[PDB]
Amino acid sequence: YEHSTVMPNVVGFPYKAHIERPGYSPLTLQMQVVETSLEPTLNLEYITCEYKTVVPSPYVKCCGASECSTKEKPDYQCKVYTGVYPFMWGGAYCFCDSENTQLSEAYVDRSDVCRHDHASAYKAHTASLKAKVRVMYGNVNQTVDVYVNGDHAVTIGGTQFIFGPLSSAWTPFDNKIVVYKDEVFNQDFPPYGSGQPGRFGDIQSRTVESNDLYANTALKLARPSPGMVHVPYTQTPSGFKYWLKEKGTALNTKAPFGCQIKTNPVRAMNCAVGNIPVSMNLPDSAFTRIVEAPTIIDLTCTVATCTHSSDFGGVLTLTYKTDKNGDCSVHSHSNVATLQEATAKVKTAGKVTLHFSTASASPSFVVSLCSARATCSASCEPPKDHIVPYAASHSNVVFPDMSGTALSWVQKISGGLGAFAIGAILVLVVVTCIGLRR
Amino acid sequence: QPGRFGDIQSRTVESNDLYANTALKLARPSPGMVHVPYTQTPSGFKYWL
Amino acid sequence: VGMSLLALISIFASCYMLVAARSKCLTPYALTPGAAVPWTLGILCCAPRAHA
Amino acid sequence: VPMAREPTVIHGKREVTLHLHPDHPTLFSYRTLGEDPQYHEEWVTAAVERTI
Numbered sequence: 001y002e003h004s005t006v007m008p009n010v011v012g013f014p015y016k017a018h019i020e021r022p023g024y025s026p027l028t029l030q031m032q033v034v035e036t037s038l039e040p041t042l043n044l045e046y047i048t049c050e051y052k053t054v055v056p057s058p059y060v061k062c063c064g065a066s067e068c069s070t071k072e073k074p075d076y077q078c079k080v081y082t083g084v085y086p087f088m089w090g091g092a093y094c095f096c097d098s099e100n101t102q103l104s105e106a107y108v109d110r111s112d113v114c115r116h117d118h119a120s121a122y123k124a125h126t127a128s129l130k131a132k133v134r135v136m137y138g139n140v141n142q143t144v145d146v147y148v149n150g151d152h153a154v155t156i157g158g159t160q161f162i163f164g165p166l167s168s169a170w171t172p173f174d175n176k177i178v179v180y181k182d183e184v185f186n187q188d189f190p191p192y193g194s195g196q197p198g199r200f201g202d203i204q205s206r207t208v209e210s211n212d213l214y215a216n217t218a219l220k221l222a223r224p225s226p227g228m229v230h231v232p233y234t235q236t237p238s239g240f241k242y243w244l245k246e247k248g249t250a251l252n253t254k255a256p257f258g259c260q261i262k263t264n265p266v267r268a269m270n271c272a273v274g275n276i277p278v279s280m281n282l283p284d285s286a287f288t289r290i291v292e293a294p295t296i297i298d299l300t301c302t303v304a305t306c307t308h309s310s311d312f313g314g315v316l317t318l319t320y321k322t323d324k325n326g327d328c329s330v331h332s333h334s335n336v337a338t339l340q341e342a343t344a345k346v347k348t349a350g351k352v353t354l355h356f357s358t359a360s361a362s363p364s365f366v367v368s369l370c371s372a373r374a375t376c377s378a379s380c381e382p383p384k385d386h387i388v389p390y391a392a393s394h395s396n397v398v399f400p401d402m403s404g405t406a407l408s409w410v411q412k413i414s415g416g417l418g419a420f421a422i423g424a425i426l427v428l429v430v431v432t433c434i435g436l437r438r
Numbered sequence: 439q440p441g442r443f444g445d446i447q448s449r450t451v452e453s454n455d456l457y458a459n460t461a462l463k464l465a466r467p468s469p470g471m472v473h474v475p476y477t478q479t480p481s482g483f484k485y486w487l
Numbered sequence: 488v489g490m491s492l493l494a495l496i497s498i499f500a501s502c503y504m505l506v507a508a509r510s511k512c513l514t515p516y517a518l519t520p521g522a523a524v525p526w527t528l529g530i531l532c533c534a535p536r537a538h539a
Numbered sequence: 540v541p542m543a544r545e546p547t548v549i550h551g552k553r554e555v556t557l558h559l560h561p562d563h564p565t566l567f568s569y570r571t572l573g574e575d576p577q578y579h580e581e582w583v584t585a586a587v588e589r590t591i
């Protein structure tokens with residue numbers, strides 16, 4: 001027997017689905033969403049790590065001259081300075097007094113720990129959602145792992161389920177991502193090959209294991225002081241370190257809807273938004289024949305108390321008349337109220353009690369026990385406490401019933417004024433028609 | 439109230455009775471040690487000072 | 488506020504309807520020195536209570 | 540690493556007043572998990588009170 005329904009994407013919400021097949025006793029299903037996971041698709045763009053600049057020992061060809069030659073190193077710098085008269089620990093060599101030359105070189109390379117301490121830049125799109133849900137009915141428990149798109153069906157004890165695509169298409173990960181350790185940032189990194197000194201991406205590599213490197217740190221060399229051998233340079237500090245110092249914020253503490261970011265792989269877990277459609281298919285062994293189910297006639301509903309709190313705060317009593325004692329499947333045919341349980345024991349005494357939760361001052365809903373029916377209407381009072389640590393178990397509707405006290409007063413006042421207006425119109429039209437008849 | 443003035447009070451200096459409310463909460467000891475951990479809000483008298 | 492404005496608008500309109508009806512029903516009698524017809528004089532509150 | 544003491548909470552009308560008693564500079568952050576959050580994070584040093 002094919003069936004379909006819709007359930008909210010809120011962790012811990014005790015969704016109950018009610019299936020009524022005309023030839024068999026009604027059945028009630030309990031479903032919950034134990035865990036979710038919104039995993040995006042990643043295209044690694046490049047990697048960054050702190051740089052390390054290497055300075056080869058200066059070559060002083062003295063009483064002679066040298067020539068500078070180019071090489072292929074990232075950000076290579078080399079120069080020749082004339083007129084050097086160096087000194088050493090014993091005494092100044094290069095005895096040819098003033099015709100000397102020093103050749104300085106410098107070039108940059110990735111740090112030693114670039115494979116242990118680095119930041120990645122990604123482009124993210126097309127999220128895929130995964131879920132883990134609990135199903136109960138009849139006498140079968142069990143939680144199962146499901147892909148949420150209309151392309152995975154999992155069988156639970158003879159029943160087949162399919163979870164349709166998410167109603168909304170909201171994803172917290174922006175178009176461009178920067179990942180470090182276990183933190184995700186909505187940053188806009190500069191493209192490959194166009195970094196700037198002193199900021200993020202001053203050196204860039206395609207991957208951690210690659211050979212090439214593109215570095216741009218404005219490395220400059222200065223003529224050495226007289227009587228020294230020290231090859232001075234100047235260079236703006238590592239961009240990665242200052243990005244570390246002033247990255248600013250994160251996503252783990254800024255994502256909406258209260259969903260936790262993690263890493264390895266990047267994902268957003270338990271992230272409350274939207275609705276999940278469910279398409280079912282059931283075998284004939286799941287139901288029960290009418291003949292063995294109890295018969296319930298003359299169903300009446302009363303409400304003991306109501307209290308629109310987060311926990312189940314209303315007690316409801318049902319009176320009936322039955323022939324034999326057994327089991328029935330309670331349900332509420334509206335979302336204004338949510339019952340706690342999905343089964344009840346019916347006995348010859350004739351009275352049963354249930355717990356429900358609401359969020360409106362005056363609810364009015366129809367409750368069914370096995371195949372019977374009844375209407376329940378009640379008045380509710382506010383809760384006195386201010387803060388609680390467990391989430392809402394009602395579906396959060398506040399518009400009252402049309403028979404509620406507030407709408408009763410509105411209706412009475414509107415009726416009085418409308419009747420007065422109709423009387424006015426009748427008087428004026430009567431006078432006009434009397435004027436015409438003459 | 440714990441954490442402010444008057445978390446510990448005595449009727450007089452020599453009084454045997456004492457009223458204390460500091461939210462002293464014990465914890466489960468870590469594996470392989472004998473140290474009886476606890477946690478407790480600092481004295482309110484020093485913060486009043 | 489919306490409900491209050493609707494109520495006031497409705498009540499003022501209906502009162503205006505009664506006023507216009509009384510003017511229409513009483514202005515012909517204000518052009519002839521005739522009887523006020525005690526039967527309608529008591530029913531509808533006109534300017535002359537008993538003065539003709 | 541150590542764990543700082545639990546703060547003291549006071550319940551209010553949609554507001555929570557919170558007493559903080561640190562021993563060394565700790566990090567304190569919070570967010571409202573609605574549709575549009577209230578981002579915030581701070582480095583508390585000496586004993587303070589916050590309202591959230």
Ligand SMILES: *[C@@H]1O[C@H](CO)[C@@H](O[C@@H]2O[C@H](CO)[C@@H](O[C@@H]3O[C@H](CO)[C@@H](O)[C@H](O)[C@@H]3O)[C@H](O)[C@H]2NC(C)=O)[C@H](O)[C@H]1NC(C)=O
Pocket residue numbers: 141142
């Ligand atoms: C369907 O299966 C799930 C998991 O197998 C059942 O949930 C489990 O219910 C038992 C009994 O209620 C829990 O054991 C108790 O947990 C409390 C938690 O405070 C603990 O204090 C007790 O000492 C005892 O261990 C168990 O934790 C719970 N499991 C989970 C993951 O929540 C569920 O009850 C089954 N359905 C039915 C109708 O029994």
